Design a protein around this ligand. Structure first.
Ligand SMILES: Nc1nc2c(ncn2[C@@H]2O[C@H](COP(=O)(O)OP(=O)(O)NP(=O)(O)O)[C@@H](O)[C@H]2O)c(=O)[nH]1
Ligand SMILES: O=C(CCn1cnc(-c2cc(C(F)(F)F)cc(C(F)(F)F)c2)n1)NNc1cnccn1
Ligand SMILES: [Mg+2]
Lengths: 1009, 122, 202
């Protein structure tokens, strides 16, 4: 194409052609824009493209071209500056400086090319980071002197100083070594008194709003680090809190400045000034922006100009200041109006419809009410504030997860993003209720009366109120709670008998279910009312009401989890414990529920049955509960034990899956008590597992791999997965491990291991690995031969599935390493039994796990390696440990170094560093007995410490050839010395990661500790 | 919206796919309400389906009597069919569509409504 | 034509390209193919204030694929900063992306999006996400996979850009649509290629 000419560096660069490609990229579209993009990236990436920057910045007509030139210079400065000849350094400096000067002396350029000037200032700052102050000592004095010669230069010097402060104090921790960060911070600190001089004189003297704003922007950055005397021993707080609050151009940045001052680090004069700038600021808001009565909800909703950002900034200022300093306002009676006016602005801000802003104000309210909860003599100050806050929160209650109806009185997806907000609203409302329980009840009862006989009936008026009522349960002591709940329930019962229609009924039913579900203490004390509630929920399980029926199931188990005892005992005036009544009607009660809801129902019944601690009576209840699935099970194992074709009935596959899902549900809540029911099905269940597995393999054989996607095979695999889930669930909660090992484990391994091993990869269930992990976790120490068999059947074939890329078979990947981790933890002997070839695959698999970006694999891999190193160390000076070190010590050292340095595994830095520190410390504690080198390689008697340093120096020399030998030797000397202090060790590694990104890093940096 | 002179014969929540023959894989085109719309003037019944929350059209074509609903190997709650003139994204283009529903019963209901609409269009 | 340049930035693998593709075609791309520099896609929404077109500059998050880097931000009129709530490092890097963006674009509406909330094992807890507050960014939990809140960043940006807080997405006009050799082959291949995610609700 025509545009690729600029990629040929043998010819002079045609600046006009560059400008066309740039304009094609920015203002063009489609194919030409994409072509130009690729050309420009290739141009930028050319390692000598910087040599053409002066020509572009001199002769170009396109500021985007000049921007791109400056980006090219930035990469050179940041990565290769110290490789350049000194004349090229001086030339680049003088050239960047002079370009900035000329843009600032041209009023027209200064006003129109802000983008290019800002990029130039940042480029200069990159030079400063390399050159200042050691090779530019006069930069700050000259900057200050040149500032008084031109308003434009002065304003731009404020941008440069702002950028320098950010680069030195805000963004240095990850971009510079510890030593270079300290150098530049100390350097700015040593000259800030001069900098502050110019900044204060501009603010007190200046009238150019653009210069003032830029000076204030730079001040915002300074406030992150400067000594407090510059803020309190000058007149600057008065300027910020009066003058610069009156003009809207400076108000935004000034407010942000004052927020940071509310964070600077016994002096009664200092307290007076902290009170004073707050008083000034609030006075300016009231007179210049809006009074405390103003409707900020409406103002925010209108979103004129920068009103939304200003209100956000005001909330941040008020919350920040008051959380730190409101005590200064609380004792002096002359400050009471200021304290309450500031909190009244916060009340008004809390009415804005803006979720993220509400969270910000809610965080403050939590801070306040938790202090009023404990601090003597404080809550009375805020009574009227807290009373208004009760109204705000009760009226902005969000949906409490358990409420499953919405919008058109229908169901949906979960409102994942409201979970934390509800919890935060509950927390504050609970505190507010403790602060004044009379006020809270009076508010709630009154809202409720105006839902029934009132002008306020609506959804979200009943809703947000019902949710608030449920959310405060536990705040009242038991007797007050008793009277309150009786009142609420009668009135909710009033609303539901009179509001008719699909929509009304669904709304009120959900609200009642939420409230009663939130007051189990009330239910425990009034058995007769608890019974009526449970029976009502059973009614709702037959509701055609989408939403209501699902919520009744959730509410049933939510109540049972808290009130289970009152179902297991025999209540006065009852013929039987109520668990008996539920079980006897379970077919009718659940007849119209969906299978997953049926399983929830059975799970709740299991919660109740486990309350019965008489073992004879508990087992009879379990047998009664499982009567329907067991009879279905007995019939289906009778039928399908002669016609493995009937097992191809989809209806039969669904029935079997649902039977096992039911057992899974009851086992989840009964745990170790489930064992008698498990034993009833165990043998036939594992026979069925084998039969189903034969069918799957036969289908794959007859139809191809595609068969695994068909509904039939997915249904058959669901049976296998649920059987595995049932066994895993029981064994994870089992209390009698002897029965687990002697009854369950051998038939399980016979049933599942060879089927996994002998299936094609696409037919292997990752749930086998998950089951085996729990088996090893619980009883692995008692089945050493069984752990070996597990490894033999799943290790090599699963590794071959997952060792070609990082993406395929993601579940097998995750379960594979959890299994290896627990085996390495619990039954390390199993790995000692491996043949050497297989143990080599084990090490390969661990290092493979390292290289995953998948946190679910990386973390276990790093942990396995650490545990393995420890496992080997525990063996002592024995042949296997000696051979391990000779074979794999340097493999683990280099593989760990590789993921530490490749910039693609930063999420594992801490555990990579831990593993590397453990490895190095092994050698510098002489915990390795044999030489790590070959007999030829180095003199006899060479310590492993000397050889390790030698090995690492060689490794880093070839892997990072742009480092000097002294950088590498200084790095290793520091790293080795620090192999007992993880935090210092880690800082040295971070220093290294900075240094490998550039040329000419100072080797003395590694002396920082 | 250009749907005011049309009667809603049938509505069901669905997920629509389009087959990328070059990449040999199904790609989602939209999730939302699939509606069968009968034009009061012409008595012609079209499928019109819009995405939730953006309300963008992801299906807009006549339920032609020549179309045949066919099963997909992976699902008992989906239908595949060739459509020769869909205008969801501008000019009429041919697609191989798959549409999946929340349950087999919804899929079977969709099929009989689809066939009834074909008889109306005749 | 009313069109606005939007830059999308964030760590590699946060779902920037998947999010845009979802809005472009409705598809969900399961593979991770890293963006090389930037890809520009026009994206139109219909509103009660007329169509609004975003020119979406979907930039690369991998440093080795970063291309022109902040050169992409020149003359952006809005932005989305993306992170992955299952990867703490990607939230840790949000201030760096924001830093580089506002140095070029000093006064633009910006949305912060925490993607992939569909994943059960969430690592960046809701209570931890506060960076947007002092910076006046809008924040949303989103999932390109489940479409949770997926329309919210564009609805908020359109409201700020048109200057209308009451702007709403509206349903496109639906024109009346028009009234066998390669087809039996393609249909066969399509019937025998399984639909993805057969365990989803739809
Ligand atoms: N579970 C889930 N995965 C998602 C989601 N969004 C994107 N992904 C997945 O994350 C991976 C990364 O996709 P991609 O869009 O390329 O991210 P990116 O930010 O563009 N990466 P880069 O900046 O290097 O181009 C993909 O495999 C994608 O399927 C999501 O919302 N949920
Ligand atoms: O009669 C009602 C009253 C409305 N109503 C809604 N919800 C309720 C309600 C809900 C629960 C629940 F447990 F589900 F939270 C418990 C209780 C009670 F307090 F009675 F124990 C009542 N009642 N409804 N049903 C019918 C049936 N035929 C005609 C009209 N209405
Ligand atoms: Mg991408």
């Amino acid at each position: 194409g025509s545009m690729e000419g600029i990629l040929d560096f043998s010819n002079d660069l045609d600046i006009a052609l560059l400008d066309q490609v740039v304009s094609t990229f920015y203002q063009g579209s489609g194919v030409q824009q994409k072509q130009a993009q690729e050309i420009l990236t290739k141009f930028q990436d050319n390692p000598d493209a910087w040599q053409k920057a002066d020509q572009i910045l001199q002769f170009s007509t396109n500021p985007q071209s000049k921007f791109i030139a400056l980006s090219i210079l930035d990469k050179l400065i940041t990565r290769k500056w110290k490789l350049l000849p000194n004349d090229h350094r001086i030339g680049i400096r003088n050239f960047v400086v002079g370009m900035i000067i000329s843009m600032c002396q041209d009023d027209e350029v200064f006003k129109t090319q802000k983008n290019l000037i800002n990029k130039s200032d940042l480029t200069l700052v990159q030079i400063l980071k390399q050159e200042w102050p050691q090779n530019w000592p006069e930069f700050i004095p000259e900057l200050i002197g040149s500032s008084s010669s031109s308003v434009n230069v002065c304003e731009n010097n404020m941008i440069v100083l702002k950028l320098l402060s950010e680069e030195v104090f805000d963004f240095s921790a990850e971009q510079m070594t510890q030593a270079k960060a300290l150098h530049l911070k100390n350097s700015m600190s040593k000259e800030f008194e001069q900098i502050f001089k110019l900044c204060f004189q501009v603010l007190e003297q200046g009238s150019s709003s653009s210069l003032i704003v830029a000076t204030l922007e730079s001040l915002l950055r300074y406030l992150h680090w400067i000594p407090y005397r510059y803020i309190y021993e000058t007149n600057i707080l008065e300027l910020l809190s009066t003058k610069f609050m009156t003009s809207p151009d400076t108000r935004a940045i000034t407010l942000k400045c004052l927020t940071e001052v509310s964070n600077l680090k016994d002096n009664d004069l200092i307290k007076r000034q902290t009170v004073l700038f707050f008083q000034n600021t609030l006075q300016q808001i009231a007179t210049s922006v809006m009074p405390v009565t103003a409707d900020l909800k409406a103002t925010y909703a209108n979103a004129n100009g920068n009103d939304q950002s200003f209100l956000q900034d005001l909330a941040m200022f008020l919350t920040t200041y008051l959380a730190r300093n409101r005590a200064l306002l609380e004792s002096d009676e002359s400050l009471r109006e200021l304290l309450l006016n500031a909190h009244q602005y916060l009340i008004q801000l809390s009415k804005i419809e803006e979720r993220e802003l509400f969270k910000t104000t809610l965080d403050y309210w939590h801070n306040l009410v938790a202090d009023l909860f404990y601090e003597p003599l404080k809550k009375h100050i805020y009574e009227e504030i807290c009373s208004q806050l009760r109204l705000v929160i009760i009226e902005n209650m969000v949906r409490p997860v358990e409420n499953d109806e919405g919008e058109i009185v229908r169901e949906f997806v979960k409102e994942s993003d409201t979970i934390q907000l509800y919890k935060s609203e509950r927390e504050v409302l609970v505190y507010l209720t403790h602060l004044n329980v009379i006020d809270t009840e009076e508010i709630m009862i009154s809202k409720l009366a105006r839902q029934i006989d009132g002008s306020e009936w609506s959804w979200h008026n009943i809703n947000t109120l019902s949710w608030a009522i449920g959310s405060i349960s536990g705040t009242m002591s038991e007797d007050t709670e008793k009277r309150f709940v009786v009142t609420v329930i009668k009135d909710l019962l009033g609303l539901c008998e009179q509001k008719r229609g699909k929509d009304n009924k669904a709304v009120v039913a959900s609200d009642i279910m939420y409230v009663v579900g939130q007051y189990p203490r009330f239910l425990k004390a009034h058995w007769n009312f608890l019974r009526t509630v449970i029976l009502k929920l059973f009614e709702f399980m037959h509701e055609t009401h989408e939403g209501v029926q699902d919520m009744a199931c959730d509410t049933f188990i939510k109540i049972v989890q808290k009130c289970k005892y009152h179902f297991v005992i025999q209540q006065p005036r009852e013929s039987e414990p109520f668990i008996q009544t539920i079980i006897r009607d379970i077919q009718k009660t659940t007849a119209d529920l969906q299978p997953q809801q049926v399983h929830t129902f059975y799970k709740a019944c299991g919660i109740i049955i486990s309350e019965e601690r008489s073992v004879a009576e508990r087992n009879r209840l379990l047998s009664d509960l499982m009567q329907l699935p067991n009879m279905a099970w007995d019939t289906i194992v009778e039928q399908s034990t002669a016609n493995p074709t009937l097992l191809l009935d989809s209806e039969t596959v669904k029935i079997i899956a649902n039977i096992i899902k039911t057992n899974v549900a009851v086992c989840t809540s009964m745990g170790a008590d489930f064992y008698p029911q498990l034993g009833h099905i165990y043998y036939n269940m594992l026979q069925l597992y084998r039969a189903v597995s034969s069918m799957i393999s036969a289908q794959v054989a007859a139809e191809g791999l595609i068969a695994t996607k068909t509904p039939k095979v997915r249904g058959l695999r669901t049976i296998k997965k649920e059987i595995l889930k049932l066994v895993e669930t029981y064994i994870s909660k089992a209390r009698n491990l002897d029965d687990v090992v002697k009854v369950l484990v051998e038939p399980l391994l016979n049933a599942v291991l060879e089927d996994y091993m002998n299936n094609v990869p696409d037919a292997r269930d990752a749930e086998v690995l998950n089951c085996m992990t729990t088996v090893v976790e619980k009883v692995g120490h008692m089945i050493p031969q069984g752990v070996i068999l597990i490894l033999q059947s799943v290790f090599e074939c699963t590794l071959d599935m997952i060792n070609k890329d990082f993406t395929e078979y993601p579940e097998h990947r995750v379960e594979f390493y959890k299994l290896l981790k627990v085996i390495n933890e619990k039954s390390f002997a199993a790995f000692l039994e491996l043949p050497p070839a297989a143990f080599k695959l084990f090490v390969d698999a661990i290092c493979w796990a390292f290289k995953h970006n998948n946190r679910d694999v990386e973390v276990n891999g790093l942990q396995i390696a650490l545990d393995l190193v420890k496992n080997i160390e525990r063996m002592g000076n024995v042949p296997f440990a000696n051979e391990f070190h000779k074979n794999y010590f340097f493999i683990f050292v280099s593989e760990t170094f590789f993921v530490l340095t490749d910039s693609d595994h930063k999420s594992g830095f801490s555990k990579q560093a831990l593993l590397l520190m453990k490895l190095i410390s092994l050698v510098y504690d002489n915990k390795i007995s044999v030489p790590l080198y070959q007999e030829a390689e180095v003199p006899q008697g060479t310590s492993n410490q000397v050889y390790l340093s030698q090995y690492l120096a060689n490794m880093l020399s070839n892997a990072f050839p742009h480092l000097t030998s002294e950088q590498i030797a200084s790095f290793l000397s520091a790293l080795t010395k620090q192999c007992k202090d993880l935090v210092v060790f880690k800082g040295t590694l971070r220093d290294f990661l900075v240094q490998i990104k550039e040329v000419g890093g100072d080797p003395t940096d590694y002396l920082f500790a | 919206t250009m749907e005011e002179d049309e009667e809603v014969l049938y509505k069901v929540r669905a997920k629509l796919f389009r087959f990328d023959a070059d990449a040999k894989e199904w790609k989602e085109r939209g999730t939302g309400d699939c509606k069968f719309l009968k034009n009061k003037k012409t008595n012609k019944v079209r499928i019109l389906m819009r995405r939730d929350k953006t309300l963008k059209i992801c299906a807009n074509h006549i339920i032609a009597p020549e179309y045949t609903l066919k099963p997909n190997v992976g699902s008992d709650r989906s239908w595949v069919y060739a459509c020769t003139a869909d205008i969801a994204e501008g000019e009429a283009e041919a697609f191989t569509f798959a549409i999946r529903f929340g349950s087999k019963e919804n899929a079977d209901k969709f099929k009989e409504e689809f066939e009834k609409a074909q008889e109306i269009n005749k | 034509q009313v069109q606005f340049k939007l830059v999308l930035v964030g760590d590699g693998g946060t779902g920037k390209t998947t999010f845009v593709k979802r809005h472009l075609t409705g598809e969900f791309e399961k593979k991770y193919v890293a963006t090389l520099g930037v890809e520009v896609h026009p994206l139109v929404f219909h509103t009660n204030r007329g169509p609004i077109k975003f020119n979406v500059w979907d930039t690369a998050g991998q440093e080795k694929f970063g291309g022109l880097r902040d050169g992409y931000y020149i003359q952006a009129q809005c932005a989305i900063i993306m992170f992955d709530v299952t990867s703490r490092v990607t939230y840790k890097n949000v201030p760096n992306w924001h830093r580089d963006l506002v140095r070029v674009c000093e006064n633009i509406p910006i949305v912060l999006c925490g993607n992939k909330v569909d994943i059960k094992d969430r690592k960046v807890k809701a209570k931890s996400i506060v960076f947007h507050r002092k910076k006046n960014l809008q924040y949303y939990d989103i999932s390109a996979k489940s479409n949770y809140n997926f329309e919210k960043p564009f609805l908020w940006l359109a409201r700020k850009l048109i200057g209308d807080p009451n702007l709403e997405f509206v349903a496109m006009p639906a024109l009346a649509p028009p009234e066998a050799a390669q087809y039996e082959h393609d249909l066969e291949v399509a019937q025998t290629t399984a639909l993805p995610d057969e365990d989803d609700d739809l």
